[PDB]
């Protein structure tokens, strides 16, 4: 249930950018749903590589591999490198 995610934590993450001082009430609500969609697609894509390796445990290297295969994940290439 996306409504379960803590909005205060989302707001705190947004505010880590020093230029980010004022945030609308609605922005963390949008990010709660976005986080669910993002985690789902990222996990599904990592699991492709888990299954390809005939493993039952999803690993960081599977996530690194998934990131290289989807240009939507370009922003993560140096965060989780192969």
């Amino acid at each position: 249930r996306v409504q379960e995610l803590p909005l205060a934590r989302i707001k705190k993450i947004m505010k880590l950018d020093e230029d980010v001082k004022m945030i609308s009430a609605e922005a963390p609500v949008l990010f709660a749903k976005a986080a669910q969609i993002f985690i789902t697609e990222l996990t599904l894509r990592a699991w492709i590589h888990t299954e390809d390796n005939k493993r039952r445990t999803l690993q960081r290297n599977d996530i690194a591999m998934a990131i290289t295969k989807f240009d939507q994940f370009d922003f993560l290439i140096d965060i989780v490198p192969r």
Binding site: D19, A27, V29, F31, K33, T40, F75, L76
Partner: protein, 88 residues
């Protein structure tokens, strides 16, 4: 380092894999890092839009513009629906 709670992240991950699939602790932590990076990436672009529009408070339209501009346009309709339901 500020992250969403690991248990919430892990629950969403678990829903995306087979019932008997397993997730390494390190992989949960990795997805935590990635989600915060995602929030920051979108927020940076939304902040620029806000400023360009002569505003100071980053709004829903700024976030949605950022998602569309940065390659996440498919998120826009589901997000609009979710926000509508949330406020109705």
């Amino acid at each position: 380092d500020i992250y969403l709670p690991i248990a919430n992240v892990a629950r969403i991950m678990k829903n995306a894999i087979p019932q008997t699939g397993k997730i390494a602790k390190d992989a949960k932590e990795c997805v935590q890092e990635c989600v915060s990076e995602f929030i920051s990436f979108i927020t940076s672009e939304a902040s620029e839009r806000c400023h360009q529009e002569k505003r100071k408070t980053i709004n829903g339209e700024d976030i949605l513009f950022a998602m569309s501009t940065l390659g996440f346009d498919s998120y826009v309709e589901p997000l609009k629906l979710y926000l509508q339901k949330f406020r109705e």
